[PDB]
Amino acid sequence: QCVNLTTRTQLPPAYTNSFTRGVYYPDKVFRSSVLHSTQDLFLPFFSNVTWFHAIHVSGTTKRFDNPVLPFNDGVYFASTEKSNIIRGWIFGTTLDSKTQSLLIVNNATNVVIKVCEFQFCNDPFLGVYYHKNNKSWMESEFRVYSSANNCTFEYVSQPFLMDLEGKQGNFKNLREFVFKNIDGYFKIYSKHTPINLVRDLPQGFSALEPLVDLPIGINITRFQTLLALHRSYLTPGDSSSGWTAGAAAYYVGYLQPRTFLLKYNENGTITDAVDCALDPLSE
Amino acid sequence: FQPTNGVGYQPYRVVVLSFELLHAPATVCGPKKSTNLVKNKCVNFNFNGLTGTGVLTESNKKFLPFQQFGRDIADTTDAVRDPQTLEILDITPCSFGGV
Ligand SMILES: *[C@@H]1O[C@H](CO)[C@@H](O[C@@H]2O[C@H](CO)[C@@H](O[C@@H]3O[C@H](CO)[C@@H](O)[C@H](O)[C@@H]3O)[C@H](O)[C@H]2NC(C)=O)[C@H](O)[C@H]1NC(C)=O
Numbered sequence: 297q298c299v300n301l302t303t304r305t306q307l308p309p310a311y312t313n314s315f316t317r318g319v320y321y322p323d324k325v326f327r328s329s330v331l332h333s334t335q336d337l338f339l340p341f342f343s344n345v346t347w348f349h350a351i352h353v354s355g356t357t358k359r360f361d362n363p364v365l366p367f368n369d370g371v372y373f374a375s376t377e378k379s380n381i382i383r384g385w386i387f388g389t390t391l392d393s394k395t396q397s398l399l400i401v402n403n404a405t406n407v408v409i410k411v412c413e414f415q416f417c418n419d420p421f422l423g424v425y426y427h428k429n430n431k432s433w434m435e436s437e438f439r440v441y442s443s444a445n446n447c448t449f450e451y452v453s454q455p456f457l458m459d460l461e462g463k464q465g466n467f468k469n470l471r472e473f474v475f476k477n478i479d480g481y482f483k484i485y486s487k488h489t490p491i492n493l494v495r496d497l498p499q500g501f502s503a504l505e506p507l508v509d510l511p512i513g514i515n516i517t518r519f520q521t522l523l524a525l526h527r528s529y530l531t532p533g534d535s536s537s538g539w540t541a542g543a544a545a546y547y548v549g550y551l552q553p554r555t556f557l558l559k560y561n562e563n564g565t566i567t568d569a570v571d572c573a574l575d576p577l578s579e
Numbered sequence: 580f581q582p583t584n585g586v587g588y589q590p591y592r593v594v595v596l597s598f599e600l601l602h603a604p605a606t607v608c609g610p611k612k613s614t615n616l617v618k619n620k621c622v623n624f625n626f627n628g629l630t631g632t633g634v635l636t637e638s639n640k641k642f643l644p645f646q647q648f649g650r651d652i653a654d655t656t657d658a659v660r661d662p663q664t665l666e667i668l669d670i671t672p673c674s675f676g677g678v
């Protein structure tokens with residue numbers, strides 16, 4: 297069922313120095329007008345963050361980079377999208393049928409969260425079809441996993457229908473995620489910040505709030521991003537070619553154990569933070 | 580299986596509930612009972628894991644949609660959100676004084 301993707305010129309991976317972003321709530325304790333010191337898996341204020349491009353030029357590099365990235369202690373996933381290209385992620389250890397894996401994917405109707413030993417592929421992705429007849433997209437061809445067996449966890453959300461059209465302009469959406477796997481619990485943090493940029497996301501601070509806590513006793517070693525593809529009548533290709541990727545880019549930063557000084561305001565929301573491992577005047 | 584069979588030869592539907600405990604976090608537990616609230620009285624409380632002793636009264640603060648409990652500057656539990664009513668209740672230590 298899986299179909300590989302050709303006509304993808306390889307380009308050297310770029311890196312973007314992340315800003316003070318990446319700070320989240322380490323616990324569910326309410327604090328107001330106090331400076332608390334925490335020693336947990338955080339993200340440094342300035343570190344190498346791998347920049348992954350997903351664009352489609354008009355001719356004389358088509359990039360659809362979504363490789364299998366490692367998961368040492370926690371990853372900071374920030375998405376700068378304009379048409380909801382990223383559908384989800386694929387967590388696990390070897391992404392094979394011998395060990396269990398985590399599948400989090402949004403297929404435009406439900407938030408599919410399954411923990412089974414799937415049989416993934418090299419290029420797992422979703423696709424849409426720009427059908428000019430009924431002026432609708434109606435995405436299909438869910439190509440993520442081939443064989444699902446021995447499921448231990450499953451969660452779906454209420455049916456909905458998000459915007460699947462390809463917007464033209466700049467990235468008017470920013471979704472930040474922080475994934476952690478400690479004591480058998482998979483903690484997910486999320487934060488949505490409406491911005492307006494094209495590349496190299498601006499400097500700012502956004503405290504990521506805890507979203508879900510999925511108890512799953514599985515080992516997470518590597519993860520892969522699930523992107524989407526656009527197809528229409530003006531696409532030369534039958535099986536492997538004949539697709540285009542909308543303008544999107546995501547950033548991946550690995551967490552490191554450091555000490556952060558969290559600043560709470562009168563409403564219990566983290567306003568600023570200080571990483572006392574970066575440079576002088578910080579300690 | 581005939582309807583005229585006596586005890587011993589009649590069909591008996593039997594189910595087996597096998598309990599398994601592994602290194603994975605516990606997902607299935609027993610129904611945790613809940614009691615009624617009480618205000619303006621020195622009563623021990625237990626919401627999620629907080630085992631303290633104080634008087635619970637209505638508060639005027641607002642927690643975040645995910646923060647369960649809070650604490651003061653002295654690192655002492657000050658308030659906690661009710662797990663059913665989603666209301667914040669202050670925690671004050673009971674009357675401590677010498678005669
Ligand atoms: C956990 O359960 C409690 C049960 O008291 C929920 O509190 C109550 O929730 C209902 C539904 O949102 C509130 O509306 C009430 O519904 C009943 C039944 O339909 C109706 O007879 C009432 O006239 C009222 O409309 C209700 O105000 C609220 N509080 C009380 C004291 O009943 C609570 O919402 C539940 N929490 C979760 C997260 O499910």
Ligand SMILES: *[C@@H]1O[C@H](CO)[C@@H](O[C@@H]2O[C@H](CO)[C@@H](O)[C@H](O)[C@H]2NC(C)=O)[C@H](O)[C@H]1NC(C)=O
Nearest residue numbers: 297298299300301302391392415416417418419
């Ligand atoms: C897609 O390309 C790969 C390699 O170019 C083909 O080979 C698969 O490679 C992956 C990882 O290297 C293995 O896990 C698979 O078992 C390989 N498959 C086979 C049949 O050897 C792969 O076959 C290609 N996909 C399709 C659908 O042809």
Ligand SMILES: *[C@@H]1O[C@H](CO)[C@@H](O[C@@H]2O[C@H](CO)[C@@H](O)[C@H](O)[C@H]2NC(C)=O)[C@H](O)[C@H]1NC(C)=O
Nearest residue numbers: 308309310311312313314342343344345346347
């Ligand atoms: C990533 O960290 C390295 C640490 O030096 C820096 O980029 C390196 O720059 C040198 C000098 O040309 C290259 O030889 C290395 O290949 C670069 N490494 C990487 C991983 O790109 C820099 O601090 C960071 N990268 C960027 C783009 O800021």
Ligand SMILES: *[C@@H]1O[C@H](CO)[C@@H](O[C@@H]2O[C@H](CO)[C@@H](O)[C@H](O)[C@H]2NC(C)=O)[C@H](O)[C@H]1NC(C)=O
Nearest residue numbers: 402403404405406407408435436438452453455
């Ligand atoms: C998105 O994924 C969900 C979950 O996999 C799909 O919901 C199931 O779809 C199958 C096949 O249509 C049904 O047999 C199930 O009853 C559905 N389950 C629930 C809970 O709804 C959903 O159909 C998918 N949507 C799209 C557009 O692919």
Ligand SMILES: *[C@@H]1O[C@H](CO)[C@@H](O[C@@H]2O[C@H](CO)[C@@H](O)[C@H](O)[C@H]2NC(C)=O)[C@H](O)[C@H]1NC(C)=O
Nearest residue numbers: 424425426427428429430431432433434435436
């Ligand atoms: C637009 O109308 C077309 C016309 O039928 C439908 O799309 C096709 O529906 C048939 C019937 O199941 C199947 O061949 C495929 O599901 C569709 N094929 C193609 C090539 O699109 C559907 O009603 C509408 N499709 C969209 C994308 O809006």
Ligand SMILES: *[C@@H]1O[C@H](CO)[C@@H](O)[C@H](O)[C@H]1NC(C)=O
Nearest residue numbers: 395396413445446447448601
């Ligand atoms: C499913 O996977 C779990 C993982 O430990 C294993 O214990 C169980 O035996 C498996 N069930 C099967 C293969 O039917």
Ligand SMILES: *[C@@H]1O[C@H](CO)[C@@H](O)[C@H](O)[C@H]1NC(C)=O
Nearest residue numbers: 389395396513514515516602
């Ligand atoms: C996870 O790793 C630990 C040690 O690294 C090992 O003991 C355990 O069996 C692993 N679990 C799985 C499901 O691979």
Ligand SMILES: *[C@@H]1O[C@H](CO)[C@@H](O)[C@H](O)[C@H]1NC(C)=O
Nearest residue numbers: 561562563564565567640641
């Ligand atoms: C804090 O909350 C008050 C109302 O409770 C509001 O007026 C104020 O704008 C909030 N401040 C911040 C920084 O959110």
